[PDB]
Design a protein around this ligand. Structure first.
Ligand SMILES: CCc1cnn2c(NCc3cnc(N)nc3)cc(-c3c(F)cccc3F)nc12
Length: 279
Protein backbone atom coordinates (compact mmCIF):
# COMPACT_ATOMS: atom_id res chain seq x y z
CA UNK A 1 0.00 0.00 0.00
CA UNK A 2 2.84 2.44 0.75
CA UNK A 3 3.35 2.28 -3.02
CA UNK A 4 0.15 4.27 -3.61
CA UNK A 5 -1.01 7.82 -3.01
CA UNK A 6 -4.76 8.15 -2.50
CA UNK A 7 -6.10 10.96 -4.67
CA UNK A 8 -9.76 10.72 -3.82
CA UNK A 9 -12.55 8.38 -2.79
CA UNK A 10 -14.43 7.58 -5.99
CA UNK A 11 -17.14 5.55 -4.36
CA UNK A 12 -18.23 2.85 -1.99
CA UNK A 13 -18.18 -0.48 -3.74
CA UNK A 14 -19.95 -3.49 -2.26
CA UNK A 15 -16.80 -4.64 -0.45
CA UNK A 16 -15.05 -1.42 0.40
CA UNK A 17 -14.18 2.06 -0.62
CA UNK A 18 -12.73 2.56 -4.09
CA UNK A 19 -10.05 5.20 -4.44
CA UNK A 20 -8.41 6.98 -7.30
CA UNK A 21 -4.71 6.60 -6.61
CA UNK A 22 -1.25 7.20 -7.94
CA UNK A 23 1.60 4.69 -8.00
CA UNK A 24 4.26 6.60 -6.07
CA UNK A 25 6.81 5.11 -8.44
CA UNK A 26 5.57 4.71 -12.03
CA UNK A 27 3.23 7.68 -11.63
CA UNK A 28 0.48 5.37 -12.96
CA UNK A 29 -3.04 6.49 -12.03
CA UNK A 30 -5.26 3.64 -10.92
CA UNK A 31 -8.39 2.69 -9.03
CA UNK A 32 -7.55 1.06 -5.71
CA UNK A 33 -10.22 -1.11 -4.12
CA UNK A 34 -9.88 -2.00 -0.42
CA UNK A 35 -11.73 -5.26 0.19
CA UNK A 36 -8.54 -13.10 3.91
CA UNK A 37 -9.97 -16.55 3.20
CA UNK A 38 -7.71 -18.46 0.80
CA UNK A 39 -10.71 -19.28 -1.38
CA UNK A 40 -11.17 -15.62 -2.19
CA UNK A 41 -7.46 -15.26 -2.96
CA UNK A 42 -7.38 -17.99 -5.61
CA UNK A 43 -10.64 -16.81 -7.18
CA UNK A 44 -9.47 -13.22 -7.38
CA UNK A 45 -6.05 -14.25 -8.66
CA UNK A 46 -7.98 -16.03 -11.41
CA UNK A 47 -9.51 -12.73 -12.48
CA UNK A 48 -6.08 -11.31 -13.32
CA UNK A 49 -6.10 -13.56 -16.40
CA UNK A 50 -9.66 -12.72 -17.50
CA UNK A 51 -8.55 -9.92 -19.85
CA UNK A 52 -10.80 -8.24 -22.44
CA UNK A 53 -11.13 -4.69 -23.82
CA UNK A 54 -14.62 -4.40 -22.28
CA UNK A 55 -13.61 -5.63 -18.84
CA UNK A 56 -11.89 -3.19 -16.45
CA UNK A 57 -8.31 -4.48 -16.19
CA UNK A 58 -7.27 -5.89 -12.82
CA UNK A 59 -3.59 -4.86 -12.63
CA UNK A 60 -2.56 -6.41 -9.37
CA UNK A 61 -3.76 -8.07 -6.21
CA UNK A 62 -2.13 -7.00 -2.96
CA UNK A 63 -2.54 -9.03 0.23
CA UNK A 64 -0.96 -7.49 3.34
CA UNK A 65 -1.57 -7.36 7.10
CA UNK A 66 -4.40 -9.72 6.31
CA UNK A 67 -5.75 -6.94 4.10
CA UNK A 68 -6.70 -7.13 0.40
CA UNK A 69 -6.19 -4.37 -2.17
CA UNK A 70 -7.22 -4.65 -5.77
CA UNK A 71 -5.41 -2.42 -8.23
CA UNK A 72 -7.46 -1.69 -11.34
CA UNK A 73 -7.21 0.41 -14.47
CA UNK A 74 -8.88 3.77 -13.80
CA UNK A 75 -11.90 5.06 -15.80
CA UNK A 76 -13.19 8.56 -15.22
CA UNK A 77 -16.92 7.99 -15.27
CA UNK A 78 -19.66 5.38 -14.83
CA UNK A 79 -22.93 4.86 -16.76
CA UNK A 80 -25.10 5.99 -13.86
CA UNK A 81 -23.51 9.43 -13.76
CA UNK A 82 -23.54 9.59 -17.56
CA UNK A 83 -27.23 8.72 -17.71
CA UNK A 84 -27.91 11.35 -15.04
CA UNK A 85 -25.92 13.80 -17.19
CA UNK A 86 -27.85 12.88 -20.35
CA UNK A 87 -31.19 13.11 -18.58
CA UNK A 88 -32.61 16.15 -20.39
CA UNK A 89 -31.98 14.84 -23.91
CA UNK A 90 -31.29 11.14 -23.43
CA UNK A 91 -28.30 9.13 -24.64
CA UNK A 92 -28.39 8.97 -28.46
CA UNK A 93 -29.58 5.60 -29.77
CA UNK A 94 -26.37 5.00 -31.75
CA UNK A 95 -24.39 5.42 -28.47
CA UNK A 96 -26.85 3.23 -26.53
CA UNK A 97 -26.47 0.61 -29.25
CA UNK A 98 -22.68 0.83 -29.19
CA UNK A 99 -22.60 0.47 -25.39
CA UNK A 100 -24.93 -2.52 -25.41
CA UNK A 101 -22.88 -4.20 -28.18
CA UNK A 102 -19.59 -3.74 -26.28
CA UNK A 103 -21.12 -5.00 -23.03
CA UNK A 104 -22.45 -8.06 -24.82
CA UNK A 105 -18.91 -8.70 -26.16
CA UNK A 106 -17.55 -8.42 -22.62
CA UNK A 107 -20.22 -10.83 -21.28
CA UNK A 108 -19.71 -13.22 -24.22
CA UNK A 109 -16.03 -13.37 -23.21
CA UNK A 110 -16.58 -13.86 -19.46
CA UNK A 111 -19.36 -16.36 -20.06
CA UNK A 112 -17.15 -18.35 -22.44
CA UNK A 113 -14.81 -18.72 -19.47
CA UNK A 114 -17.70 -19.72 -17.25
CA UNK A 115 -17.35 -16.55 -15.21
CA UNK A 116 -20.47 -14.66 -14.17
CA UNK A 117 -20.69 -11.05 -13.10
CA UNK A 118 -23.87 -11.50 -10.99
CA UNK A 119 -24.32 -7.85 -10.11
CA UNK A 120 -24.39 -5.69 -13.24
CA UNK A 121 -25.64 -2.17 -12.66
CA UNK A 122 -25.01 1.29 -14.14
CA UNK A 123 -22.63 2.12 -11.30
CA UNK A 124 -20.26 -0.65 -12.38
CA UNK A 125 -20.32 0.02 -16.13
CA UNK A 126 -17.42 2.41 -16.71
CA UNK A 127 -16.84 4.64 -19.70
CA UNK A 128 -13.99 6.59 -21.29
CA UNK A 129 -13.55 9.39 -23.81
CA UNK A 130 -12.80 6.90 -26.61
CA UNK A 131 -16.41 5.69 -26.61
CA UNK A 132 -15.54 2.47 -24.77
CA UNK A 133 -17.60 0.94 -21.98
CA UNK A 134 -16.30 -1.68 -19.54
CA UNK A 135 -17.67 -4.16 -16.99
CA UNK A 136 -16.26 -3.46 -13.50
CA UNK A 137 -16.15 -5.70 -10.44
CA UNK A 138 -16.41 -8.74 -12.69
CA UNK A 139 -16.27 -12.04 -10.79
CA UNK A 140 -15.99 -10.38 -7.37
CA UNK A 141 -19.37 -11.85 -6.37
CA UNK A 142 -18.31 -15.51 -6.54
CA UNK A 143 -25.62 1.20 1.86
CA UNK A 144 -28.47 -0.89 0.47
CA UNK A 145 -27.43 -3.15 -2.41
CA UNK A 146 -29.74 -2.48 -5.33
CA UNK A 147 -32.13 -5.19 -6.49
CA UNK A 148 -33.25 -3.31 -9.62
CA UNK A 149 -31.26 -5.47 -11.98
CA UNK A 150 -31.71 -8.84 -10.27
CA UNK A 151 -32.89 -11.74 -12.42
CA UNK A 152 -36.18 -13.38 -11.34
CA UNK A 153 -34.57 -16.82 -10.85
CA UNK A 154 -32.29 -15.29 -8.20
CA UNK A 155 -35.31 -13.63 -6.50
CA UNK A 156 -37.16 -16.97 -6.58
CA UNK A 157 -34.33 -18.74 -4.77
CA UNK A 158 -32.55 -20.58 -7.59
CA UNK A 159 -29.19 -21.46 -5.99
CA UNK A 160 -27.39 -22.44 -9.15
CA UNK A 161 -28.29 -19.66 -11.53
CA UNK A 162 -26.51 -19.20 -14.82
CA UNK A 163 -24.88 -16.72 -17.14
CA UNK A 164 -28.46 -15.79 -18.06
CA UNK A 165 -28.62 -13.60 -14.92
CA UNK A 166 -26.15 -11.16 -16.51
CA UNK A 167 -28.23 -11.04 -19.70
CA UNK A 168 -31.29 -10.08 -17.63
CA UNK A 169 -29.39 -7.31 -15.84
CA UNK A 170 -28.07 -5.88 -19.12
CA UNK A 171 -31.58 -5.95 -20.58
CA UNK A 172 -32.81 -3.88 -17.63
CA UNK A 173 -29.92 -1.45 -18.16
CA UNK A 174 -30.68 -1.28 -21.97
CA UNK A 175 -34.34 -0.32 -21.19
CA UNK A 176 -33.17 2.30 -18.67
CA UNK A 177 -30.85 3.94 -21.20
CA UNK A 178 -33.67 4.14 -23.68
CA UNK A 179 -36.45 5.44 -21.42
CA UNK A 180 -34.37 7.41 -18.91
CA UNK A 181 -36.02 5.67 -16.00
CA UNK A 182 -35.19 2.44 -14.16
CA UNK A 183 -37.23 -0.45 -15.53
CA UNK A 184 -37.93 -2.28 -12.22
CA UNK A 185 -36.91 -0.04 -9.28
CA UNK A 186 -37.88 -2.45 -6.48
CA UNK A 187 -37.15 -1.53 -2.88
CA UNK A 188 -37.49 -5.01 -1.41
CA UNK A 189 -37.25 -8.54 -2.78
CA UNK A 190 -41.03 -8.95 -3.05
CA UNK A 191 -41.43 -5.45 -4.49
CA UNK A 192 -38.77 -6.22 -7.08
CA UNK A 193 -40.47 -9.50 -8.06
CA UNK A 194 -43.91 -7.90 -8.18
CA UNK A 195 -42.62 -5.03 -10.34
CA UNK A 196 -41.29 -7.59 -12.79
CA UNK A 197 -44.61 -9.53 -12.71
CA UNK A 198 -46.69 -6.37 -13.28
CA UNK A 199 -44.80 -5.66 -16.48
CA UNK A 200 -43.95 -9.07 -17.87
CA UNK A 201 -46.92 -10.89 -16.35
CA UNK A 202 -46.83 -13.33 -13.44
CA UNK A 203 -44.83 -16.33 -14.69
CA UNK A 204 -46.48 -19.76 -14.82
CA UNK A 205 -45.65 -23.21 -16.08
CA UNK A 206 -46.58 -22.15 -19.60
CA UNK A 207 -43.89 -19.51 -20.09
CA UNK A 208 -41.42 -20.93 -17.54
CA UNK A 209 -41.56 -24.73 -16.94
CA UNK A 210 -40.48 -25.54 -13.38
CA UNK A 211 -41.16 -22.03 -12.01
CA UNK A 212 -43.84 -23.13 -9.55
CA UNK A 213 -41.29 -25.48 -7.97
CA UNK A 214 -38.73 -22.80 -7.18
CA UNK A 215 -37.89 -22.36 -3.50
CA UNK A 216 -39.42 -18.91 -3.04
CA UNK A 217 -42.30 -19.27 -5.45
CA UNK A 218 -45.73 -18.96 -3.82
CA UNK A 219 -49.00 -19.99 -5.40
CA UNK A 220 -50.47 -16.98 -3.66
CA UNK A 221 -48.53 -14.55 -5.95
CA UNK A 222 -51.06 -12.20 -7.62
CA UNK A 223 -51.63 -12.99 -11.30
CA UNK A 224 -50.91 -9.96 -13.48
CA UNK A 225 -51.15 -9.91 -17.26
CA UNK A 226 -48.18 -9.12 -19.48
CA UNK A 227 -47.70 -5.62 -20.95
CA UNK A 228 -46.62 -4.91 -24.56
CA UNK A 229 -43.02 -3.81 -25.00
CA UNK A 230 -44.37 -1.02 -27.14
CA UNK A 231 -45.69 0.43 -23.85
CA UNK A 232 -42.55 -0.49 -21.88
CA UNK A 233 -39.71 1.03 -23.92
CA UNK A 234 -41.20 3.50 -26.38
CA UNK A 235 -39.99 4.62 -28.68
CA UNK A 236 -37.43 1.87 -29.17
CA UNK A 237 -37.66 0.36 -32.68
CA UNK A 238 -38.89 -3.18 -33.40
CA UNK A 239 -35.36 -4.62 -33.64
CA UNK A 240 -34.47 -3.21 -30.20
CA UNK A 241 -37.79 -4.28 -28.70
CA UNK A 242 -37.35 -7.80 -30.15
CA UNK A 243 -33.85 -8.00 -28.63
CA UNK A 244 -34.97 -6.63 -25.29
CA UNK A 245 -37.85 -9.14 -25.15
CA UNK A 246 -35.38 -12.00 -25.58
CA UNK A 247 -32.97 -10.67 -22.93
CA UNK A 248 -35.93 -10.51 -20.54
CA UNK A 249 -37.37 -14.00 -21.18
CA UNK A 250 -38.48 -15.54 -17.86
CA UNK A 251 -37.00 -18.99 -18.48
CA UNK A 252 -33.22 -18.60 -18.13
CA UNK A 253 -32.85 -21.46 -20.58
CA UNK A 254 -34.69 -19.53 -23.24
CA UNK A 255 -33.09 -16.16 -22.47
CA UNK A 256 -30.82 -15.10 -25.32
CA UNK A 257 -27.08 -15.69 -24.79
CA UNK A 258 -24.58 -12.83 -25.15
CA UNK A 259 -23.14 -14.52 -28.24
CA UNK A 260 -26.55 -14.89 -29.94
CA UNK A 261 -27.50 -11.36 -28.94
CA UNK A 262 -24.41 -10.04 -30.77
CA UNK A 263 -25.87 -11.55 -33.98
CA UNK A 264 -29.25 -9.88 -33.56
CA UNK A 265 -30.46 -7.59 -36.42
CA UNK A 266 -30.44 -4.65 -33.97
CA UNK A 267 -26.66 -4.51 -34.34
CA UNK A 268 -26.62 -4.60 -38.13
CA UNK A 269 -25.90 -0.84 -38.23
CA UNK A 270 -23.86 -0.61 -35.03
CA UNK A 271 -21.17 2.10 -34.84
CA UNK A 272 -18.89 3.55 -32.17
CA UNK A 273 -19.72 7.18 -31.47
CA UNK A 274 -17.78 9.31 -29.02
CA UNK A 275 -19.72 10.45 -25.99
CA UNK A 276 -19.36 13.99 -24.82
CA UNK A 277 -17.78 13.57 -21.43
CA UNK A 278 -17.10 16.43 -19.06
CA UNK A 279 -14.28 15.46 -16.69
C1 LIG B 1 -12.03 -0.61 -9.16
C2 LIG B 1 -12.15 -0.52 -10.67
C3 LIG B 1 -12.57 0.83 -11.13
C4 LIG B 1 -11.91 1.69 -12.05
N1 LIG B 1 -12.55 2.84 -12.23
N2 LIG B 1 -13.68 2.73 -11.44
C5 LIG B 1 -14.74 3.66 -11.32
N3 LIG B 1 -14.66 4.81 -12.09
C6 LIG B 1 -15.69 5.75 -12.46
C7 LIG B 1 -15.70 6.91 -11.53
C8 LIG B 1 -14.62 7.76 -11.36
N4 LIG B 1 -14.61 8.79 -10.50
C9 LIG B 1 -15.72 8.96 -9.76
N5 LIG B 1 -15.72 9.97 -8.87
N6 LIG B 1 -16.82 8.18 -9.83
C10 LIG B 1 -16.78 7.17 -10.71
C11 LIG B 1 -15.74 3.36 -10.46
C12 LIG B 1 -15.69 2.04 -9.77
C13 LIG B 1 -16.84 1.71 -8.90
C14 LIG B 1 -17.11 2.40 -7.71
F1 LIG B 1 -16.32 3.41 -7.30
C15 LIG B 1 -18.21 2.06 -6.91
C16 LIG B 1 -19.05 1.01 -7.29
C17 LIG B 1 -18.78 0.31 -8.47
C18 LIG B 1 -17.69 0.68 -9.27
F2 LIG B 1 -17.49 -0.01 -10.38
N7 LIG B 1 -14.74 1.17 -9.91
C19 LIG B 1 -13.71 1.51 -10.76
Amino acid sequence: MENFQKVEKIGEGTYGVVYKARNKLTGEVVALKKIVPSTAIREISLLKELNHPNIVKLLDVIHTENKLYLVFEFLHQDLKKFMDASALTGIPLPLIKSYLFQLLQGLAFCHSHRVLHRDLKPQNLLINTEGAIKLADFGLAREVVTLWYRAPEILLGCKYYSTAVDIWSLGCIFAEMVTRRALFPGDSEIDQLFRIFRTLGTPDEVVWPGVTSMPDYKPSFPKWARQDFSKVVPPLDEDGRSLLSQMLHYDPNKRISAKAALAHPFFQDVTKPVPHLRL
